[PDB]
Amino acid sequence: MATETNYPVPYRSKLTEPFEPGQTLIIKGKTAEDSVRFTINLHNTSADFSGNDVPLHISVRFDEGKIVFNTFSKGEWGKEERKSNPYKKGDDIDIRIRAHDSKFSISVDQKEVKEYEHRVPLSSVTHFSVDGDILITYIHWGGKYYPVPYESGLAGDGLAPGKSLLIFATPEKKGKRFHINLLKKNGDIALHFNPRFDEKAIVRNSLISGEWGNEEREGKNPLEKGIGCDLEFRNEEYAFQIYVDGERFATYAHRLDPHDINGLQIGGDVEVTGIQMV
Ligand SMILES: CC(=O)N[C@H]1[C@H]([C@H](O)[C@H](O)CO)O[C@@](O[C@H]2[C@@H](O)[C@@H](CO)O[C@@H](O[C@H]3[C@H](O)[C@@H](O)[C@@H](O)O[C@@H]3CO)[C@@H]2O)(C(=O)O)C[C@@H]1O
């Protein structure tokens, strides 16, 4: 209701392909002190008809103080399922919906709060809409089931200054530690990002010619077992700017010339749900 900008509401988007197991839909926005409610719908339709079926309807109610889930099909609504609404009028919201074969897992502020079993085909979801008292500031749909240990190459130029590698993951509930390596062609690790819960610290280092370097820790681990996190590795001219959940966690001065960072590896006790180059 403030600055239209991107994603103005009523917002609607036709998916390029049907929503599939794995795959997450992320919605972030701002609310006003007078916001009453907003909705997020996964639905069916041709491309302008609208309605039809709504496999998953999410209603965030500030008046009722609840988040409500339901399904509409064959012209009828089923029985609503509710959870408490942790948000107060005003303040930002972060809701994420990941599809699985037997249900949708919905997280609020990166915390799992609802498991909604499919009532109608997940495949009938061809669009998603957002409407109501919310100023959308971020939307993204994609990802998949990333096996871990994970391993792959990066684009053509890969990670170069001016670019950033965005990773969505959730440290495992009973995990001790995990790591992410940004590698160069010859196999050297430009950056080793290694959160260690058993040591309450995130270790950063580089692997050059089979040798581990100095090693930088300290900064207070901002991650939490079982809680989702948004990791951003901003490659800059003099260093990597490491962002955790929107806040700069650390800076890591380059030990290997940046440029040509074309490899990625992820291992340890962690679940990866999204990887993207921005
Ligand atoms: C007293 C001592 O020698 N400490 C050495 C430690 C310990 O052997 C280690 O912490 C025991 O778990 O190892 C040191 O080098 C480690 C460090 O580079 C970390 C950084 O993540 O990597 C360790 O190897 C990891 C590997 O990277 C993972 O992929 C996986 O294989 O786990 C192994 C460890 O089992 C290095 O051993 C260290 O500083 O911690 C060197 C210390 O001298």
PDB file of all heavy atoms in Angstrom, residues 179-198:
ATOM      1  N   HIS A 179      29.315 -27.828   5.655  1.00  0.00           N
ATOM      2  CA  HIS A 179      30.195 -26.863   5.025  1.00  0.00           C
ATOM      3  C   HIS A 179      29.785 -26.627   3.587  1.00  0.00           C
ATOM      4  O   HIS A 179      29.025 -27.404   3.003  1.00  0.00           O
ATOM      5  CB  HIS A 179      31.633 -27.387   5.049  1.00  0.00           C
ATOM      6  CG  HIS A 179      31.823 -28.640   4.249  1.00  0.00           C
ATOM      7  ND1 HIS A 179      31.463 -29.886   4.721  1.00  0.00           N
ATOM      8  CD2 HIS A 179      32.267 -28.831   2.984  1.00  0.00           C
ATOM      9  CE1 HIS A 179      31.675 -30.789   3.777  1.00  0.00           C
ATOM     10  NE2 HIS A 179      32.162 -30.175   2.713  1.00  0.00           N
ATOM     11  N   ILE A 180      30.308 -25.542   3.030  1.00  0.00           N
ATOM     12  CA  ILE A 180      30.068 -25.166   1.649  1.00  0.00           C
ATOM     13  C   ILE A 180      31.420 -24.719   1.092  1.00  0.00           C
ATOM     14  O   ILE A 180      32.095 -23.877   1.679  1.00  0.00           O
ATOM     15  CB  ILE A 180      29.054 -24.000   1.543  1.00  0.00           C
ATOM     16  CG1 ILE A 180      27.692 -24.431   2.103  1.00  0.00           C
ATOM     17  CG2 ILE A 180      28.892 -23.578   0.080  1.00  0.00           C
ATOM     18  CD1 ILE A 180      26.665 -23.309   2.162  1.00  0.00           C
ATOM     19  N   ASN A 181      31.830 -25.301  -0.025  1.00  0.00           N
ATOM     20  CA  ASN A 181      33.103 -24.926  -0.618  1.00  0.00           C
ATOM     21  C   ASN A 181      32.904 -24.275  -1.970  1.00  0.00           C
ATOM     22  O   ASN A 181      32.157 -24.790  -2.803  1.00  0.00           O
ATOM     23  CB  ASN A 181      34.003 -26.154  -0.811  1.00  0.00           C
ATOM     24  CG  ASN A 181      34.291 -26.873   0.483  1.00  0.00           C
ATOM     25  OD1 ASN A 181      34.546 -26.243   1.511  1.00  0.00           O
ATOM     26  ND2 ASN A 181      34.263 -28.201   0.441  1.00  0.00           N
ATOM     27  N   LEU A 182      33.564 -23.135  -2.168  1.00  0.00           N
ATOM     28  CA  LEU A 182      33.533 -22.421  -3.436  1.00  0.00           C
ATOM     29  C   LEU A 182      34.907 -22.769  -4.006  1.00  0.00           C
ATOM     30  O   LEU A 182      35.937 -22.386  -3.441  1.00  0.00           O
ATOM     31  CB  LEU A 182      33.389 -20.917  -3.196  1.00  0.00           C
ATOM     32  CG  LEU A 182      32.197 -20.529  -2.318  1.00  0.00           C
ATOM     33  CD1 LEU A 182      32.135 -19.016  -2.148  1.00  0.00           C
ATOM     34  CD2 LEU A 182      30.913 -21.052  -2.949  1.00  0.00           C
ATOM     35  N   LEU A 183      34.925 -23.509  -5.110  1.00  0.00           N
ATOM     36  CA  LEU A 183      36.185 -23.956  -5.682  1.00  0.00           C
ATOM     37  C   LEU A 183      36.586 -23.400  -7.032  1.00  0.00           C
ATOM     38  O   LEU A 183      35.756 -22.939  -7.818  1.00  0.00           O
ATOM     39  CB  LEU A 183      36.200 -25.486  -5.795  1.00  0.00           C
ATOM     40  CG  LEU A 183      35.747 -26.333  -4.605  1.00  0.00           C
ATOM     41  CD1 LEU A 183      34.239 -26.489  -4.660  1.00  0.00           C
ATOM     42  CD2 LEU A 183      36.409 -27.702  -4.658  1.00  0.00           C
ATOM     43  N   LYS A 184      37.884 -23.479  -7.290  1.00  0.00           N
ATOM     44  CA  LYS A 184      38.453 -23.033  -8.547  1.00  0.00           C
ATOM     45  C   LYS A 184      38.677 -24.260  -9.418  1.00  0.00           C
ATOM     46  O   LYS A 184      38.585 -25.388  -8.942  1.00  0.00           O
ATOM     47  CB  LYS A 184      39.766 -22.301  -8.298  1.00  0.00           C
ATOM     48  CG  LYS A 184      39.569 -20.844  -7.937  1.00  0.00           C
ATOM     49  CD  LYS A 184      40.891 -20.194  -7.615  1.00  0.00           C
ATOM     50  CE  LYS A 184      40.862 -18.717  -7.931  1.00  0.00           C
ATOM     51  NZ  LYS A 184      40.696 -18.460  -9.387  1.00  0.00           N
ATOM     52  N   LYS A 185      38.979 -24.031 -10.692  1.00  0.00           N
ATOM     53  CA  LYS A 185      39.181 -25.112 -11.647  1.00  0.00           C
ATOM     54  C   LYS A 185      40.169 -26.196 -11.232  1.00  0.00           C
ATOM     55  O   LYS A 185      39.907 -27.385 -11.432  1.00  0.00           O
ATOM     56  CB  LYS A 185      39.611 -24.536 -12.998  1.00  0.00           C
ATOM     57  CG  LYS A 185      39.508 -25.527 -14.146  1.00  0.00           C
ATOM     58  CD  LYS A 185      38.068 -26.008 -14.312  1.00  0.00           C
ATOM     59  CE  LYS A 185      37.934 -27.043 -15.424  1.00  0.00           C
ATOM     60  NZ  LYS A 185      36.536 -27.562 -15.511  1.00  0.00           N
ATOM     61  N   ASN A 186      41.299 -25.795 -10.658  1.00  0.00           N
ATOM     62  CA  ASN A 186      42.315 -26.762 -10.256  1.00  0.00           C
ATOM     63  C   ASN A 186      41.976 -27.484  -8.963  1.00  0.00           C
ATOM     64  O   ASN A 186      42.772 -28.279  -8.466  1.00  0.00           O
ATOM     65  CB  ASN A 186      43.687 -26.085 -10.119  1.00  0.00           C
ATOM     66  CG  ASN A 186      43.727 -25.065  -8.998  1.00  0.00           C
ATOM     67  OD1 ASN A 186      42.752 -24.895  -8.264  1.00  0.00           O
ATOM     68  ND2 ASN A 186      44.861 -24.380  -8.857  1.00  0.00           N
ATOM     69  N   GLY A 187      40.796 -27.211  -8.414  1.00  0.00           N
ATOM     70  CA  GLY A 187      40.401 -27.877  -7.185  1.00  0.00           C
ATOM     71  C   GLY A 187      40.681 -27.133  -5.889  1.00  0.00           C
ATOM     72  O   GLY A 187      40.309 -27.614  -4.813  1.00  0.00           O
ATOM     73  N   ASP A 188      41.341 -25.979  -5.959  1.00  0.00           N
ATOM     74  CA  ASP A 188      41.599 -25.234  -4.735  1.00  0.00           C
ATOM     75  C   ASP A 188      40.268 -24.685  -4.239  1.00  0.00           C
ATOM     76  O   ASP A 188      39.382 -24.362  -5.030  1.00  0.00           O
ATOM     77  CB  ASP A 188      42.557 -24.058  -4.967  1.00  0.00           C
ATOM     78  CG  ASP A 188      43.984 -24.499  -5.257  1.00  0.00           C
ATOM     79  OD1 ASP A 188      44.505 -25.406  -4.565  1.00  0.00           O
ATOM     80  OD2 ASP A 188      44.592 -23.909  -6.175  1.00  0.00           O
ATOM     81  N   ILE A 189      40.122 -24.588  -2.925  1.00  0.00           N
ATOM     82  CA  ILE A 189      38.901 -24.050  -2.358  1.00  0.00           C
ATOM     83  C   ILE A 189      39.149 -22.583  -2.032  1.00  0.00           C
ATOM     84  O   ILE A 189      39.918 -22.261  -1.125  1.00  0.00           O
ATOM     85  CB  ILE A 189      38.503 -24.799  -1.074  1.00  0.00           C
ATOM     86  CG1 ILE A 189      38.217 -26.270  -1.397  1.00  0.00           C
ATOM     87  CG2 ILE A 189      37.256 -24.163  -0.459  1.00  0.00           C
ATOM     88  CD1 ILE A 189      37.824 -27.097  -0.178  1.00  0.00           C
ATOM     89  N   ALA A 190      38.524 -21.697  -2.803  1.00  0.00           N
ATOM     90  CA  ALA A 190      38.666 -20.264  -2.583  1.00  0.00           C
ATOM     91  C   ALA A 190      38.108 -19.974  -1.202  1.00  0.00           C
ATOM     92  O   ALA A 190      38.736 -19.275  -0.406  1.00  0.00           O
ATOM     93  CB  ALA A 190      37.886 -19.483  -3.641  1.00  0.00           C
ATOM     94  N   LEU A 191      36.925 -20.515  -0.923  1.00  0.00           N
ATOM     95  CA  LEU A 191      36.295 -20.324   0.378  1.00  0.00           C
ATOM     96  C   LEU A 191      35.630 -21.583   0.929  1.00  0.00           C
ATOM     97  O   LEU A 191      34.873 -22.256   0.241  1.00  0.00           O
ATOM     98  CB  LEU A 191      35.249 -19.211   0.323  1.00  0.00           C
ATOM     99  CG  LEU A 191      34.443 -19.048   1.624  1.00  0.00           C
ATOM    100  CD1 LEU A 191      35.394 -18.788   2.792  1.00  0.00           C
ATOM    101  CD2 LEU A 191      33.450 -17.892   1.480  1.00  0.00           C
ATOM    102  N   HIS A 192      35.934 -21.870   2.187  1.00  0.00           N
ATOM    103  CA  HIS A 192      35.388 -22.999   2.927  1.00  0.00           C
ATOM    104  C   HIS A 192      34.568 -22.333   4.032  1.00  0.00           C
ATOM    105  O   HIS A 192      35.134 -21.666   4.894  1.00  0.00           O
ATOM    106  CB  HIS A 192      36.538 -23.804   3.541  1.00  0.00           C
ATOM    107  CG  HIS A 192      36.102 -24.956   4.393  1.00  0.00           C
ATOM    108  ND1 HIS A 192      35.441 -26.052   3.880  1.00  0.00           N
ATOM    109  CD2 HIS A 192      36.262 -25.198   5.716  1.00  0.00           C
ATOM    110  CE1 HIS A 192      35.215 -26.921   4.852  1.00  0.00           C
ATOM    111  NE2 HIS A 192      35.704 -26.427   5.975  1.00  0.00           N
ATOM    112  N   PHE A 193      33.243 -22.488   3.977  1.00  0.00           N
ATOM    113  CA  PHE A 193      32.303 -21.921   4.962  1.00  0.00           C
ATOM    114  C   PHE A 193      31.815 -23.137   5.749  1.00  0.00           C
ATOM    115  O   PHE A 193      31.054 -23.951   5.225  1.00  0.00           O
ATOM    116  CB  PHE A 193      31.138 -21.259   4.225  1.00  0.00           C
ATOM    117  CG  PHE A 193      30.054 -20.721   5.124  1.00  0.00           C
ATOM    118  CD1 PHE A 193      30.211 -19.501   5.782  1.00  0.00           C
ATOM    119  CD2 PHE A 193      28.861 -21.416   5.283  1.00  0.00           C
ATOM    120  CE1 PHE A 193      29.187 -18.975   6.584  1.00  0.00           C
ATOM    121  CE2 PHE A 193      27.830 -20.901   6.084  1.00  0.00           C
ATOM    122  CZ  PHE A 193      27.998 -19.675   6.734  1.00  0.00           C
ATOM    123  N   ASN A 194      32.240 -23.240   7.007  1.00  0.00           N
ATOM    124  CA  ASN A 194      31.949 -24.405   7.834  1.00  0.00           C
ATOM    125  C   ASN A 194      31.334 -24.188   9.230  1.00  0.00           C
ATOM    126  O   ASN A 194      32.053 -24.149  10.233  1.00  0.00           O
ATOM    127  CB  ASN A 194      33.259 -25.193   7.975  1.00  0.00           C
ATOM    128  CG  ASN A 194      33.120 -26.448   8.812  1.00  0.00           C
ATOM    129  OD1 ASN A 194      34.092 -26.903   9.410  1.00  0.00           O
ATOM    130  ND2 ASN A 194      31.919 -27.023   8.849  1.00  0.00           N
ATOM    131  N   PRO A 195      30.000 -24.052   9.311  1.00  0.00           N
ATOM    132  CA  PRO A 195      29.311 -23.853  10.596  1.00  0.00           C
ATOM    133  C   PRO A 195      29.472 -25.092  11.481  1.00  0.00           C
ATOM    134  O   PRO A 195      29.137 -26.206  11.069  1.00  0.00           O
ATOM    135  CB  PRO A 195      27.853 -23.653  10.182  1.00  0.00           C
ATOM    136  CG  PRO A 195      27.973 -23.028   8.830  1.00  0.00           C
ATOM    137  CD  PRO A 195      29.076 -23.837   8.186  1.00  0.00           C
ATOM    138  N   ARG A 196      29.984 -24.898  12.694  1.00  0.00           N
ATOM    139  CA  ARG A 196      30.196 -25.999  13.628  1.00  0.00           C
ATOM    140  C   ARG A 196      29.433 -25.754  14.926  1.00  0.00           C
ATOM    141  O   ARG A 196      29.889 -25.002  15.786  1.00  0.00           O
ATOM    142  CB  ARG A 196      31.683 -26.145  13.946  1.00  0.00           C
ATOM    143  CG  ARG A 196      32.567 -26.395  12.741  1.00  0.00           C
ATOM    144  CD  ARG A 196      34.021 -26.476  13.154  1.00  0.00           C
ATOM    145  NE  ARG A 196      34.889 -26.771  12.020  1.00  0.00           N
ATOM    146  CZ  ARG A 196      36.201 -26.950  12.110  1.00  0.00           C
ATOM    147  NH1 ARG A 196      36.798 -26.864  13.286  1.00  0.00           N
ATOM    148  NH2 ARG A 196      36.915 -27.214  11.021  1.00  0.00           N
ATOM    149  N   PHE A 197      28.276 -26.395  15.065  1.00  0.00           N
ATOM    150  CA  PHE A 197      27.454 -26.235  16.261  1.00  0.00           C
ATOM    151  C   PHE A 197      28.125 -26.810  17.503  1.00  0.00           C
ATOM    152  O   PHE A 197      27.904 -26.332  18.612  1.00  0.00           O
ATOM    153  CB  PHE A 197      26.095 -26.893  16.038  1.00  0.00           C
ATOM    154  CG  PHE A 197      25.282 -26.229  14.973  1.00  0.00           C
ATOM    155  CD1 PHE A 197      25.309 -26.701  13.664  1.00  0.00           C
ATOM    156  CD2 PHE A 197      24.513 -25.109  15.268  1.00  0.00           C
ATOM    157  CE1 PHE A 197      24.580 -26.063  12.662  1.00  0.00           C
ATOM    158  CE2 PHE A 197      23.778 -24.462  14.272  1.00  0.00           C
ATOM    159  CZ  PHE A 197      23.812 -24.943  12.967  1.00  0.00           C
ATOM    160  N   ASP A 198      28.947 -27.834  17.310  1.00  0.00           N
ATOM    161  CA  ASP A 198      29.661 -28.468  18.410  1.00  0.00           C
ATOM    162  C   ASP A 198      30.776 -27.562  18.922  1.00  0.00           C
ATOM    163  O   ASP A 198      31.444 -27.884  19.902  1.00  0.00           O
ATOM    164  CB  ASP A 198      30.265 -29.799  17.952  1.00  0.00           C
ATOM    165  CG  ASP A 198      31.155 -29.650  16.728  1.00  0.00           C
ATOM    166  OD1 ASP A 198      31.223 -28.539  16.159  1.00  0.00           O
ATOM    167  OD2 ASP A 198      31.788 -30.650  16.331  1.00  0.00           O
TER     168      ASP A 198
END
